[PDB]
Amino acid sequence: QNTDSMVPLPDPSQATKLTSWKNELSLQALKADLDAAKPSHTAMMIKVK
């Protein structure tokens, strides 16, 4: 059983590049946006419940 749910973050900025864009988003930026947006959504779902 291989589960990766506590792995210490994805690769850093210097790793592999999928696209040819000059500036690439990388996974850290996306997960940071998700963790920034989650507190409001968590407060909202209470009313639905």
């Binding site: 973050l9 997960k31 968590t42 779902m45 209470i46």
Partner: protein, 51 residues
């Protein structure tokens, strides 16, 4: 001979008189030096369940 001398460290300029001093004696960058948030590792691991 009008000499600049050294306005700081107690020596007035020649042009100045009994009651005066250079108004500007230094230059200010106005770009402060600041640190950054120390990185955190354990916080992203945990999920959150509301109460």
């Amino acid at each position: 001979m009008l000499n600049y001398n050294a306005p700081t460290d107690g020596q007035k300029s020649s042009i100045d008189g009994a009651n005066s001093d250079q108004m500007q004696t230094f230059f200010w960058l106005k770009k402060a030096i600041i640190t950054a948030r120390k990185e955190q590792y354990f916080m992203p691991l945990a999920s959150v369940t509301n109460m």
